[model samples]
Target: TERPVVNVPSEITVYRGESFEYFATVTDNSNAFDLAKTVVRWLYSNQPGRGTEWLQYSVTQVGNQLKVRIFGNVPIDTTIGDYTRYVVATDAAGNVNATQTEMGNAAVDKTSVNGQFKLIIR
Candidate 1:
């Protein structure tokens, strides 16, 4: 099975107390099952490949694509740096497949697909 690929912006810049909208496309080669059954999330971290924060995004399906919209905002106390953001997808067996972690890190989170992008908040 081909892993799902999360299509998102490679970089984004947002200001404190400002809100922005981002889009993601979840793609897979498999046949359509249930679009609404697909789960998507946003993972973030101050360091690359070392994640500790999680955010939820709204997702909808159009044809074979999982269209995701993320309304993002940075708090006044937020840190400014190169942060990593990744999209995680799962089916009904979310809990069972999410057991794999990278050296006690966050869940790998998928059998079909996952992807990572960069974020810059100033």
Candidate 2:
């Protein structure tokens, strides 16, 4: 079985009171159909004791390139610290083909600080 290559942003900055979209591309070496059927997931954390839960996201394939979009919910009172984000790709057979930030981590920082804010994305 062939493995898929993933491309994602290493770092980004988002406004405290706004939400942003993080886009990524996935490619298979031998089969586009296999890549298209791959499951995409993501997870993020800010504090040490926060959740490392991996949440599933929508994946769209155009020819051989798989596109993934992550909707980030930034809080207005988000602390001025670097946050970690991760992405994982798995095929239909439950085989992991690609995993980003497997050992490392991505950073997401805020531009400014504000009052306490809660994210409500539906």
Candidate 3:
């Protein structure tokens, strides 16, 4: 199997009541099918302990990679803590998947890379 994956900046910082886009660097070295039909999923958390409910967003591949920019909205309801967000990619076949998240939730924070993205919701 190919190491199909997505990459992004190690961390992003934003304040509460603010938002920003975290772009994705999608690549597949295994000469996979065209990424034209990939669906980008966005998930957010002031803290991953909140939930896995990802917000909806998208991207259209230009060549082999997708530069998907996801906007993070630090809700007014958000509390003061290190927030997190993740982006997962799904192929047209509905078979492939990949994701990135802030450091907290075990689901997306696989490597304990918590606080990768910080949002001090003030």
Top candidate, metric lDDT = 1
Clashing pairs in 1: 3-112, 4-112, 4-113
Candidate 1 vs. true structure, TM-score: 0.61
Cα-based lDDT for every prediction: 0.53, 0.47, 0.47
In candidate 3, stretches whose alpha carbon ends up further than 4 angstroms from where it belongs are 30-56, 83-85, 91-122
Q: Candidate 2, residues 30-114: lDDT per residue as tens digits?
A: 4454544454332333221232122235678777677877555556666544444444554444455434343232223332111
Backbone clashes counted, model 2: 0
**1-122 per-residue lDDT for model 1 (tens digits):** 54555677777666666677878777666533244544433443322233213234677877776787866555666666775555555433232122225312643442222355566777
Error of 2 at 18 (Å): 1.2
Residue 1, model 3: Cα distance from true site in angstroms: 5.3
Off by over 4 Å in 1: 33-56, 91-114
Clashes of each: 3, 0, 3
Stretches of candidate 2 exceeding 4 Å from the true structure: 32-56, 98-122
